[PDB]
Specification:
Chain A: The modification Phosphoserine is found at residue 126. The structure is cut from a larger assembly and holds chains A (222 residues) and B (158 residues). By secondary structure, chain A is an alpha+beta fold. The radius of gyration of chain A is 38 Å and the shape is elongated. In chain A, strands 1, 2, 3, 4, 5, 6 and 7 form a seven-stranded mixed sheet that branches. In chain A, strands 8-10-9 form a three-stranded antiparallel sheet. In chain A, a hairpin with a 4-residue loop joins strand 3 (40-46) and strand 4 (51-57). Chain A has a domain at 156-218: Winged helix-like DNA-binding domain superfamily/Winged helix DNA-binding domain (Arc Repressor Mutant, subunit A), CATH 1.10.10.10. In chain A, 6% of the residues are buried. Chain A has helices spanning 9-12, 24-32, 59-62, 108-120, 144-156, 164-177, 183-190, 194-204, and strands at residues 6-7, 16-21, 40-46, 51-57, 65-70, 78-83, 87-100, 180-182, 206-208, 216-218. Chain B has a domain at 48-155: Cyclin A, domain 1 (Orthogonal Bundle). In chain B, helix 1 packs across helix 3 (30-44) and helix 4 packs antiparallel against helix 5. The longest helix of chain B is centred in the middle third of the chain and has 16 residues, at 68-83. At the A-B interface, loops of A face helix 2 and helix 7 of B.
Chain lengths: 222, 158
């Protein structure tokens, strides 16, 4: 008993199914009329030494499709499914293969042309422009990003100088998190001017070369 | 410095580009370019000729796709407006844009204050104010040898 266990009833009962190849337009109409359950009729005719398969589309849906059978002995095909309840199963083995083709040929090439034209619509091509574009680099007093950045800088204001005791408390609070820190990161952590911070740090901490990607300060006072 | 140097070169070449146009192509703001501009003049001990209304008519009218006769009329209107002192203290760009608006509205190719303002780099209010000052004297500003698609007496009043 496992999620991957497959219900092999399809194989055990030897359920046989037919794999049929049909055009996209045909199956698209069947999917559209799926709610009707009257997409068409499938006719099979067998003779003394010949058999044929064909499908007739419903008049309302259309507003004969002979089928050509293909060998299934050259490769063993099987049908399996996965249930939404996380239960896999094997429906059966493919016992016959067929492919749908239209009965007519000359007028059918018209439909293919229409499908090609519809399929050509998304193929974007360079458009010729009669007049030069005069809206590029339109005169502007100051760029959008600059006034926004300036507003943030001026609204937040510069970093103030906290009292020496609070700066030391923050530094030791950072030391509990990590032994050493890069000055750029320490400035952001302590939120103090780089000059003011360095003056307080140099009195206790020191800077030493380490294998880390950037020069780091050592916070141990001794 | 490079942005301000580019403005000075255009002025020296007789093809002035407004600070808004130089700012539109540079990351530097108009204000900073303006500050560097005066500093360079002192540093170089040089000076540049005063801008005039006719220095922008060719570029603005062409960017607006205005006909040749409309550009000529706008040039005459702007030049005569300065000579008549109808626009005291007004920036030449504002006067040029207002003259272009007047000539355009008088022609078949009519352009809105926003369209002219966007290309000339002037606020519609500034254009409207400059236009309101010159509108009463419009028949004197237009050339005598000009073809009116819309008569001067029917020009927009505001």
């Amino acid at each position: 008993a496992e999620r991957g266990e497959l219900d092999l009833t399809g194989a055990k009962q030897n359920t046989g199914v037919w794999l049929v190849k049909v055009p996209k337009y045909l199956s698209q109409q069947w999917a559209k009329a799926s709610g009707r359950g009257e997409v068409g009729k499938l006719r099979i005719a067998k003779t003394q030494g010949r058999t044929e398969v064909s499908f007739t589309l419903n008049e309302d849906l259309a507003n004969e499709h002979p089928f050509v059978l293909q060998s299934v002995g050259g490769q063993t095909l099987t049908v399996f499914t996965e249930s939404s309840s996380d239960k896999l199963s094997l429906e059966g083995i493919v016992v016959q293969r067929a492919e749908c083709r239209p009965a007519a040929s000359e007028n059918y090439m018209r439909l293919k042309r229409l499908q090609i034209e519809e399929s050509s619509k998304p193929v974007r091509l360079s458009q010729q422009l009669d007049k030069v574009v005069t809206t590029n680099y339109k005169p502007v007093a100051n760029h959008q990003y600059n006034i926004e950045y300036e507003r943030k800088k001026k609204e937040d204001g510069k970093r103030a100088r906290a009292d020496k005791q609070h700066v030391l408390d923050m530094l030791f609070s950072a030391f509990e998190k990590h032994q050493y820190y890069n000055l750029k990161d320490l400035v952001d952590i302590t939120k103090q001017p780089v000059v003011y911070l360095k003056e307080i740090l140099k009195e206790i901490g020191v800077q030493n070369v380490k294998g880390i990607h950037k020069n780091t300060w050592e916070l141990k006072p001794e | 410095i490079a942005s301000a140097c580019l403005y000075i070169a255009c002025r020296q070449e007789g093809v002035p580009r407004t600070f808004k146009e130089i700012c539109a192509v540079s990351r530097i703001s108009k204000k900073e370019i303006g500050r560097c501009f005066k500093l360079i003049l002192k540093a170089l001990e040089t000076s540049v000729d005063l801008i005039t209304t006719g220095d922008f008519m060719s570029r603005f009218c062409s960017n607006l796709c205005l006909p040749k006769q409309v550009q000529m009329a706008a040039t005459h209107i702007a030049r005569k407006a300065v000579e008549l002192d109808l626009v005291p203290g007004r920036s030449p760009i504002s006067v040029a844009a207002a003259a272009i608006y007047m000539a355009s509205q008088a022609s078949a190719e009519k352009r809105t204050q926003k369209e002219i303002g966007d290309i000339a780099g002037v606020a519609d209010v500034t254009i409207r104010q400059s236009y309101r000052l010159i509108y009463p004297r419009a028949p004197d500003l237009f050339p005598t040898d000009f073809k009116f698609d819309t008569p001067v007496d029917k020009l927009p009043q505001l």
